C-alpha cells in the first residue's frame, strides 16, 4: 500500500446556505469593486491605470 495511501480521499463539509431577509432592511449597503472596467477606455487602460 505504498502508492495507494494518497488515494484515500475525503470530502469537505462546508454548507453554503444563509437566509437573506431583506424585509428587515430598508437601506442600501456599500459594495466593493473587484476588477477594473475594461469595456470603457480599453485602449488607454495601461496609460491611466496608475492614476487616481
Amino acid at each position: 500500500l505504498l502508492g495507494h495511501t494518497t488515494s484515500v480521499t475525503m470530502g469537505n463539509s462546508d454548507i453554503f446556505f444563509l437566509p437573506k431577509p431583506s424585509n428587515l432592511l430598508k437601506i442600501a449597503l456599500p459594495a466593493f469593486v473587484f476588477m477594473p472596467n475594461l469595456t470603457i477606455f480599453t485602449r488607454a487602460f495601461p496609460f491611466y491605470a496608475h492614476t487616481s
Binding site: 459594495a31 466593493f32 469593486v33 473587484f34 476588477m35 477594473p36 472596467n37 475594461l38 469595456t39
Partner: peptide, 8 residues
C-alpha cells in the same frame, strides 16, 4: 465588472 451583487 462593477460594484453590484451580480458582479460579486
Amino acid at each position: 465588472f462593477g460594484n453590484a451583487w451580480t458582479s460579486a
